[PDB]
C-alpha cells in the first residue's frame, strides 16, 4: 500500500491549506518510509514545525530542516544520512517529491517539491513521491519565494501526519 501523508501549511501562522502526498513505497521503500516516519513524528523528531526555507518560483519548494543531536539541517530515521536507494523515478513535472542532498549517498530529511520538470536532477536526487492533493497550495507557496530562494514570509509545516 503506498502510504499517504499530509502537511498543513501556514504563512506567518495564517492557515494556507493542506498538501497531501503519495509515497512510492513500491519503488523506493526505504526513502518512502523515511519521509513517512518524519511526517508522523514517530521517531521523536520530524517535519512538524519545520519550514520551507528555500522556495524558487518555477523550480521547487525545499524544506525539512530541524534541530538534532549533531546539527540543524535535519536527519533521517536511519541515522544522520542514508544511501541513494535508486534512481528509477524521474523529475517529470510539477508535484514530484524528491530528496535534497549534498552529494552522493547523503540523504537526510530535507526534501523538495518540484513545480516544474527538472530533468537535470535525474540520477542525482532520489524521487520518491508526488503531490496527491493541494497543488494549488504549493502554487501559493511559490508567491512567497524569490529567485534567491529566501522566502518573504515564513512558510511552515504547522501540522503533518499520515492519512493512509
Domain ranges within the chain, ordered by starting residue: 1-164
d(CA 115, CA 94) in angstroms, rounded, equals 4
Burial-class residue 41 by CB neighbours within 10 Å (0-12, 13-18, 19+): middle
What are the DSSP E strand ranges found in 31-154? 54-56, 60-63, 96-99, 111-114, 127-133
Q: What are the catalytic residues? A: 54, 59, 62, 101, 112, 121, 125
Cell numbers standing for residue 25: 513505497
Contact 17, 131 (CB under 8 A): no
124 class by beta-carbon count within 10 Å (0-12 exposed, 13-18 middle, 19+ buried): middle
- Burial code (b: 16+ CB inside 10 Å, e: under 16) for 125-157 equals bbbbbbbbebeebbeebbebbeeebebeeebbb
Q: Give the integer Cα–Cα distance in Å for 24 and 32.
A: 6
Alpha helices for the chain (secondary structure H):
29-40, 135-142
CA distance 107 to 100: 7
Resolution of this model in Å is 1.5
Q: How far from 115 is each of 67, 70, 119, 131, CA to CA, in Å? A: 27, 31, 12, 10
Tell the residue number behind the cell numbers 508567491, with chain if given: 143
| Locus of grid cell 536526487 | 125
153 close to 49: Cβ distance less than 8 angstroms: no
CA distance readout (Å), 129 to 15, 70, 152: 24, 28, 27
Q: How far is residue 113's CA from residue 134's CA, in Å, rounded to a whole number?
A: 12
Cα–Cα distance measured from residue 164 to residue 155, given in angstroms and rounded to the nearest whole number = 25
Best CA proximity match to 15, nearest among 132, 115, 156? 156
Write down the residue that cell numbers 501562522 correspond to.
Answer: 13
Domain 1-164 - what CATH class?
mainly beta
Report d(CA 162, CA 36) in Å as an integer: 7
Task: Please tell me the distance from the alpha carbon of residue 33 to that of residue 107, in angstroms, as a whole number.
Answer: 13
Amino acid at each position: 500500500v503506498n502510504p499517504t501523508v499530509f502537511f498543513d501549511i501556514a504563512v506567518d501562522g495564517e492557515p494556507l491549506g493542506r498538501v497531501s502526498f503519495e509515497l512510492f513505497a513500491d519503488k523506493v521503500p526505504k526513502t518512502a518510509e523515511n519521509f513517512r516516519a518524519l511526517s508522523t513524528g514517530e521517531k521523536g523528531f520530524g517535519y512538524k514545525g519545520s519550514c520551507f526555507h528555500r522556495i524558487i518560483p518555477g523550480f521547487m519548494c525545499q524544506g525539512g530542516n530541524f534541530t538534532h543531536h549533531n546539527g540543524t539541517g535535519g536527519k533521517s530515521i536511519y541515522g544522520e544520512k542514508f544511501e541513494d536507494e535508486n534512481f528509477i523515478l524521474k523529475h517529470t513535472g510539477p508535484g514530484i517529491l524528491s530528496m535534497a542532498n549534498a552529494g552522493p549517498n547523503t540523504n537526510g530529511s530535507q526534501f523538495f517539491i518540484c513545480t516544474a520538470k527538472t530533468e537535470w536532477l535525474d540520477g542525482k536526487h532520489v524521487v520518491f513521491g508526488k503531490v496527491k492533493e493541494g497543488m494549488n497550495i504549493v502554487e501559493a507557496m511559490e508567491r512567497f519565494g524569490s529567485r534567491n530562494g529566501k522566502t518573504s514570509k515564513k512558510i511552515t509545516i504547522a501540522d503533518c501526519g499520515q492519512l493512509e
